[PDB]
Amino acid sequence: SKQPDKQRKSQRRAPLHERHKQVRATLSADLREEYGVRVNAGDTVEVLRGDFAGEEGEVINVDLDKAVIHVEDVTLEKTDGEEVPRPLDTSNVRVTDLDLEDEKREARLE
Amino acid sequence: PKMKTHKMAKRRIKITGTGKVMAFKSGKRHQNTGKSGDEIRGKGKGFVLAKAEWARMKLMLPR
RNA sequence: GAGCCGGUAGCGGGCGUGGAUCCCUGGAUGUCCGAAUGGGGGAACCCGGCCGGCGGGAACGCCGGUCACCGCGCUUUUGCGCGGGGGGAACCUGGGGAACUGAAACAUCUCAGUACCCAGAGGAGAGGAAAGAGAAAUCGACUCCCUGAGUAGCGGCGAGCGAAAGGGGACCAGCCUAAACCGUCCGGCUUGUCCGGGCGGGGUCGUGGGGCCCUCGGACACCGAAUCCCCAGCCUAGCCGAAGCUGUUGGGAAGCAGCGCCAGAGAGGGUGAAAGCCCCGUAGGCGAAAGGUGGGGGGAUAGGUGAGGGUACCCGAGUACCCCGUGGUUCGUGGAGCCAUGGGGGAAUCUGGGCGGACCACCGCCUAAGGCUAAGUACUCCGGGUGACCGAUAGCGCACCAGUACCGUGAGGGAAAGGUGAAAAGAACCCCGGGAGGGGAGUGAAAUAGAGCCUGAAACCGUGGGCUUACAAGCAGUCACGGCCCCGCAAGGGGUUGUGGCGUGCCUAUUGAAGCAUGAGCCGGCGACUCACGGUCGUGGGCGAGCUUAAGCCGUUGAGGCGGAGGCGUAGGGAAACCGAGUCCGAACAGGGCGCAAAGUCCGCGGCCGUGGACCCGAAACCGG
RNA sequence: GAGCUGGGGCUAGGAGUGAAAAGCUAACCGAGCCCGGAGAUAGCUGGUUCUCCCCGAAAUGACUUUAGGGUCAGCCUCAGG
RNA sequence: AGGUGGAGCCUGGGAGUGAGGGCGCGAGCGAUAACGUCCGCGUCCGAGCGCGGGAACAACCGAGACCGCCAGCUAAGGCCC
RNA sequence: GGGGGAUGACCCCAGGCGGUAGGGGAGCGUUCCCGAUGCCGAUGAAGGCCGACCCGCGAGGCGGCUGGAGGUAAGGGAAGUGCGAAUGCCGGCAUGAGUAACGAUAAAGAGGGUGAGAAUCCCUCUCGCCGUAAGCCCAAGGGUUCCUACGCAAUGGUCGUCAGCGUAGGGUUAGGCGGGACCUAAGGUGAAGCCGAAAGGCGUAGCCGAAGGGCAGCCGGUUAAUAUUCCGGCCCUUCCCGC
RNA sequence: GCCUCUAAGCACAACCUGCGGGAACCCGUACCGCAAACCGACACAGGUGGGCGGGUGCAAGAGCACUCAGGCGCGCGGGAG
RNA sequence: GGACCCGGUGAAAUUGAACUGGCCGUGAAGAUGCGGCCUACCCGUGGCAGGACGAAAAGACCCCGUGGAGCUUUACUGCAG
């Protein structure tokens, strides 16, 4: 990991959880400030960019896989019709309501 | 890297600081030449100009 | 650390924090081929002994396991138990080993001991404590880098080939056995005293070893391993990890503006258009294991050698030495040695025996005719780092269902081909139509971004328009004058031409060229005076005695700085002895070289000259497998 | 019938075979073909790129297994005296 | 002596052609034959000594092409079209 | 060259200036490395497309249209650098040219049928060509090409609803047929044996080696395809255990 | 395969026979196949080994003319002459 | 039976480029393109060969490179035997 391309080499080829490494971030005031150690993943938040910028929503699906996730809110409808969840650019991602009602959620991040 | 007809460098050859070079008369003698005497008095040294450039050069360096 | 059943996105179904996917390491399966090895064979198939369940044997009997090739030691007995062989890009030594081409032919020579083939060792082999080097009574392993030196020198003295000791540097490092002398024996002959092989003595580093007699003397000396954990390094994932938000032009902002923080980590990359502070598992910096491989380093293992004189003496080899015929060496037959050997003679055991280049005297060196020896140099399949290194005809030829498609019987050849977008949101539905494909709607910032769908130029085929075209010559055309047509650089120009006016295309090689001499159908991209070491003049400049190897150290950036063997100038003149601002010819003051300082030297950048495939492609041929 | 033939094989490419012309040897063997020496040498042949300034050539003589090469001269050019 | 004016000389780096023809003249050969060749004296061309002339024609007579389209004298050569 | 040049420049006149090999000087764009107290751009990097300002020039600038993301260096450094042009290499693209060819002069024509559309398919009726073949068969070679249901984009040197073309499904069974579970000649291997510098050469016996030797059957039926194997009727062989 | 037999074991259990029960594998087949499915790079009038090859006529006969069974009209059709 | 007219398909070497006439002259000496002149409307298809020094191929006949390759003998040398 000392060159441009060795980034694709220990992130997605190595431990997929390394991609978890990607789900990385912070969120609201509470929690955050409070720290930032111990995540949740499929939590809630509210992006901060892209037309949808400054929006309200929640963490639907830990997609690490595709390299990002989905946010019920954030989405769109096809052209045939039916609606649908859009792709979640890892990038602009916000979480404040730190999914933690599940004791195991509060025993790791908040 | 370089050397030189080391030869000629051997036989006939060798320069003066002057930037010039000379080798022994070279009329006839030392082969056929019952010929004469005074003719004998015909072997000191001969300094040819112009060409003495291939020469010198080609030798260049040590001599 | 919380998602997954690989690239498959799709249907149908499912595992999971009372630690799934996957990252590691050590496992158990590993069907058939392939050194193949049980036997055969046109590989990937077909055949046999022993055990084996016993197995459907419904009231009737099989696969599985197995096993065994052959050359190697030798507990020999009837031989039981260990090693090998096959690979492998490049690199290593041995075994064998060539023409081209240069010499402007070519027989000597060169390319070379190169290219190739063969065998085999290794992770490195090569080599390696000297019958060495040379001569200052000086040096000491081998190797490798610089230097010595393009010197001494080899030669149809032609083209060329072209050492070494010594000095500087990296490394260090030393040991064994036959080596019958002693004793031990075991086996023979046949009892003695012979040869024999296992045990020690010694088991030689730079001359010693034994055997005898008296002095001995009575603990720190580990190698190539052997050993223990040690930091065992790495082995993939180890994990934390400083600090901004609002406003805004925007389809998108991380941009434009306002305030705000970081900081040994403003390395880069991903983020809808360019962030230190959004993601980054990055540089900040600390982190990390029960298994696979070291030095460093600690210890005993420590294996192991380690002092005195004397005596008549016996103890590292079967061929040294010599004659002929080759080798290697700088040595091409030479005044020609050392070492290595093809044939034939066939010595010595320390006043022995080679050596210092024919030989000889004397001096000086060394002690052969067995063996082992890490480290210092080479090489990249592998993994990383870095780029005045490339961008799809460049780079490996091959950026991803390529050494595959494809021609070749074979050995072998050996290609082309990447790019939508922010993500599919990849075009439901309606239309002409057998469809493909075209018309609308919808995504959309734009689809003349639309599915081989970024940029998408030229050549070349179309569709309309301006001008122009039927008594006319030349590719061309360009100068004059005229009419139609447009004047986003208006009283000046655009475009097109009717006439007339003067006109032989374009490249190489040519005395000479339009050409009827050749070169080219058209467009686009590749495509040809380069680099290195020398030398050579010119110039930009640092000191005049000027200047640096190789290496040692220092190194986000990584910062150069020390290193003084050398080499050119400091006189030269001469074959040399040698002399020397003088000298060689000579016996003569007659000339040749030089003196007279004018002094360079290193470097940079250039026009060139030699070695180079070396301005670029071009053939018939020779030589290897 | 030194007859034509299928199938199985043996020889081999400086060497084979050849009722023999130098024939045939995977469709051109007067010495095969592939990879290697190797990008062989190649007075010959072509090829030999952007602009512009300045001057201005020879096609003779001398020696060459040299004559359609090239050495030295002669005629060019730039730097200083 | 030099009116000249701009060639000359030495040292030094970098070169190219190393085989040409055409015309006049003086010679050689040759059938005084050839756009023949062979030596000389000047010129000439050199793939641009490109333009004028002689119809056209490197080339022989005149000429030295830095550039200026709607100037002026002439050369050689011409002026009935 | 020369008369004074302030750095330009300005004035005189002398004085030419046509030029290939080839010699000297000066400049231009090309991709890179500086960022010598350098950074432009979503109101476009760049390339592209088009032009009546700047230069002798090779280029510049600059304005209009295009296109999705870069890179510029005011100055010095570096180099795989500038192309008609090599019967050049690679790619495309025109020629001749809507002429030359349909691969044997063994000819067809008619009615119906299917289909979006049939000279070129299916049924049917005349007619022509085989007939030693343009026959069935065994082999060798090639390997699903064979059948059946769908379909025609390209291959079919025209069509094409046809295919020996596409996708999907399915097809070929043997104690007695062939190959082995048997045999040897050539030849090839090859423990022993024999000779090579090494790789290797030869080579006994034994083994490999075939439509040569040997070996136990035949006729009918039966699907979209198989058949001496599937049906059935008829004919057998070798091994094993028992008596 | 048939007969002769050593080693050798049978010699109330070795081989021949008779009857009855029991056993019988490995891999090959489609269709093309004087050929668009095989070699000639292509649906190329080129080659490729064995089996009677049906008849009528001709002295005979795989030669010949017509045709049996089975095969096919050549994979480009019209139209002037 | 092609060729010709129809429908269907639809190549190919060579070629700088071209709107390419005859003449008699010319030039490097056998010209559609240069001079003078004479005929001269624009395009096409079925043809006929003459010229475009037509196409094929960087002459095999030639000479030149102190090129190459094969056979020959009292060529030179050297090896096999």
Explained architecture:
This is part of a larger assembly, with chains A (110 residues) and B (63 residues). With 110 residues, chain A is low in regular secondary structure. A two-stranded antiparallel ribbon of chain A has the order 1-2. Chain B is 16% helix and 13% strand. Chain B has a two-stranded antiparallel sheet with strand order 1-2. Chain A binds 6 RNA strands through α1.
Descriptors:
part of a larger assembly; 2 chains; A: 110 residues; little secondary structure; SH3 type barrels; two-stranded antiparallel sheet; globular; B: two-stranded antiparallel ribbon; elongated; RNA-binding
Q: Can you count the beta strands of chain B?
A: 4
Secondary-structure element series of chain B: HEEEEH
| Total count of helical runs of at least 4 residues of chain A | 2
CATH hierarchy class name of chain A: Mainly Beta
Using only C-alpha atoms, the radius of gyration of chain A works out to 15 Å
Class from secondary-structure proportions of chain A:
little secondary structure
Summarize the helix and strand pattern of chain A as letters.
HEEH
β-strand amount of chain A: under 5%
Give Rg of chain B in angstroms: 14 Å
Q: How far apart lie the N and C ends of chain A?
A: 32 Å
Main β sheet profile of chain A: 2 strands, antiparallel
PDB class: ribosome
Keywords: ribosome, translation, release factor
Entry title: Crystal structure of the whole ribosomal complex.
Chain A: 50S ribosomal protein 24
